[PDB]
């Protein structure tokens, strides 16, 4: 059982899954509407979105007293985010501007990756070592999609038996994708291309929001139960409540370095020879140079105009 990091609107909290009966520790307090949360363990960073302050912020959790730092601002509805701990990038969704965007860990070099055919984008999960990103959209045409972390090769992997796909997580050991649907009340899994789909928890989940994973156990927050639930990732058995009486549970992660497995950054020490952004890519050489929004990449594929 790992530590579980979750957003709670008014704060961010850390609870030990093996001892969830106790009160959670507050990692960050004094927030308005903290929704999405993630981390870069090796950098000692925790990131969150606040939908009321229209921003993504970060804090250094390895400093006795580090302040809240605004990294990205002017985000109308930053409903989901994910940290690329390999390429050192921040990814997020905005369900009001209907966009998916990337930036450096400090918020510099913002680049809009997708801005079309998004209605209610929500959850976003990264597989940095394979250069793929995954997201849900619970809008008029609900779906799960994946694309290169460089904005390449977008395509829909799930578009049936889906309505409110709120939670999304990856199993890096088994190469599987898991998601929770809050209208259809279930958790399903599949291969990373969407094939070989199967049910984990068949039904009876009141309103699951965010989903995470550690070893053989799935963990998720539920808006109606105001709690964190758990079950076996293979059979869906052992369904149990880990941590209860939560003010307003939101996004959640298994908070462990093991959930961010070390790998070689294909960018190297060279930033891939990229003038600006060096993004993870699903195709060799597994990185791709990119530029801030509206800025053109020159003929060499490395230098921004």
């Amino acid at each position: 059982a790992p530590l579980l990091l979750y957003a709670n609107r008014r704060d961010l909290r850390l609870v030990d899954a093996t001892n969830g009966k106790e009160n959670a520790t507050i990692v960050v307090g004094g927030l308005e509407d903290a929704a999405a949360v993630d981390f870069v363990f090796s950098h000692g960073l925790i990131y969150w979105s606040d939908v009321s302050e229209e921003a993504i912020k970060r804090t250094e959790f390895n400093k006795t007293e580090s302040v809240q730092n605004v990294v990205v601002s002017g985000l109308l509805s930053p409903d989901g985010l994910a940290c690329d701990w390999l390429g050192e990038k921040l990814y997020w969704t905005d369900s009001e501007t209907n966009r998916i965007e990337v930036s450096n860990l400090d918020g510099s070099l913002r680049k809009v990756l997708f801005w079309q055919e998004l209605d209610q984008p929500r959850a976003i999960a990264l597989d940095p070592s394979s250069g793929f990103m995954y997201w849900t959209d619970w809008g008029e045409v609900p779906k799960i999609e994946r694309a290169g972390m460089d904005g390449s090769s977008r395509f829909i992997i799930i578009n049936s038996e889906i309505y409110w796909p709120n939670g999304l997580t990856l199993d890096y050991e088994e190469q599987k994708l898991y998601w929770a649907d809050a209208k259809l009340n279930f958790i399903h899994k599949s291969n990373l291309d969407g094939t070989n789909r199967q049910a984990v928890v068949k039904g009876s989940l009141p309103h699951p929001f965010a989903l995470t994973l550690f070893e053989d156990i799935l963990y998720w927050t539920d808006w109606s139960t105001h709690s964190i639930l758990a079950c076996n990732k293979y059979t869906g058995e052992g369904l149990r409540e880990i941590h209860s009486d939560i003010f307003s549970p939101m996004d959640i992660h298994a908070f462990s370095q093991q959930r961010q497995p070390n790998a070689t950054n294909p960018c190297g020490i060279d930033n891939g020879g990229c003038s600006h952004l060096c993004l993870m890519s699903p195709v060799k050489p597994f990185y791709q140079c990119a530029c801030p929004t509206g800025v053109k990449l020159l003929e060499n594929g490395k230098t921004c105009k």
Binding site: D33, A35, W164, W223
Partner: peptide, 7 residues
């Protein structure tokens, strides 16, 4: 149930 984050 409403599924919006803001409400």
């Amino acid at each position: 149930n409403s599924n919006a984050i803001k409400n």
